[PDB]
Design a protein around this ligand. Structure first.
Ligand SMILES: Nc1ncnc2c1ncn2[C@@H]1O[C@H](COP(=O)(O)OP(=O)(O)OP(=O)(O)OP(=O)(O)OP(=O)(O)OC[C@H]2O[C@@H](n3cnc4c(N)ncnc43)[C@H](O)[C@@H]2O)[C@@H](O)[C@H]1O
Ligand SMILES: [Mg+2]
Length: 212
């Protein structure tokens, strides 16, 4: 399956993506994860990305398109399919992506658009805690771990309230035209994101199994 998963910050993309990958073995391509990995290893692009990410701003299109194109061009993608997560994030990236996918013969087959009340997002990101090794995300209220030990968790630097508030403003402005772009193509599946995590997934699982 050639898939995009989309949604505002905190809408549950990563949470759902982890469940999707566990069942379908599509390649999870998360620009967020790619940036944070680079940042942790202090690579050149990581140092660049940090500058934008810590302020809740978009990393420039040029670098972003490049790292996604690089991953999409690998030899596994055509056979296994992929799940693009957090990209495209501007209409410019959408246009760039579409041309690349057509060239590689891996055109999108579906968009999973997770719709969530934006009034819920500040609390979702404020209460987020992340397991170190896996990067599995939890929520101190809505999705807490069974036995919390501090050595296994941390908080994302961009989950500070002021950064979250900036991230929401930036992505609310860019988001609508991208959804419209793919809705026009008949590829969008709107998901009720205002449910329990497992209910959101069961909805997504039904959509994905009904593809092809
Ligand atoms: N293409 C691009 N172009 C330019 N720049 C780019 C870029 N891509 C990335 N960047 C840069 O990198 C930065 C970060 O990108 P990125 O990592 O992609 O941030 P994001 O897009 O905002 O996504 P998030 O990880 O913040 O939210 P999520 O939907 O995955 O939430 P989660 O599932 O963990 O869940 C959130 C929390 O809510 C909880 N939760 C999940 N589901 C539910 C539920 N159903 N009910 C209650 N709580 C829930 C979770 O437990 C968790 O605590 C960007 O700000 C940008 O600077
Ligand atoms: Mg995520």
């Amino acid at each position: 399956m050639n898939l995009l998963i989309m949604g505002l910050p905190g809408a549950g993309k990563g949470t759902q993506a982890a469940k999707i990958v566990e069942q379908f073995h599509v390649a999870h391509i998360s620009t967020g994860d790619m940036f944070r990995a680079a940042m942790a290893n202090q690579t050149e692009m990581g140092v660049l990305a940090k500058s934008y990410i810590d302020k809740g701003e978009l990393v420039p299109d040029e670098v972003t398109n490049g790292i996604v194109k690089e991953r999409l061009s690998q030899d596994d993608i055509k056979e296994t399919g992929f799940l693009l997560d957090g990209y495209p994030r501007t209409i410019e990236q959408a246009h760039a992506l579409d041309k690349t996918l057509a060239e590689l013969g891996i055109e999108l087959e579906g968009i999973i658009n997770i719709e969530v009340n934006p009034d819920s997002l500040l609390e979702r990101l404020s209460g987020r805690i992340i397991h170190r090794v896996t990067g599995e995300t939890f929520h101190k209220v809505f999705n807490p771990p069974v036995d919390y030990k501090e050595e296994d968790y941390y908080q994302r630097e961009d989950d500070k309230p002021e950064t979250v508030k900036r991230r929401l403003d930036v992505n609310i402005a860019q988001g609508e035209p991208i959804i419209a772009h793919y809705r026009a193509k008949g590829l969008v599946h709107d998901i009720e994101g205002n449910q329990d995590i497992n209910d959101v997934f069961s909805d997504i699982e039904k959509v994905l199994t009904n593809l092809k």
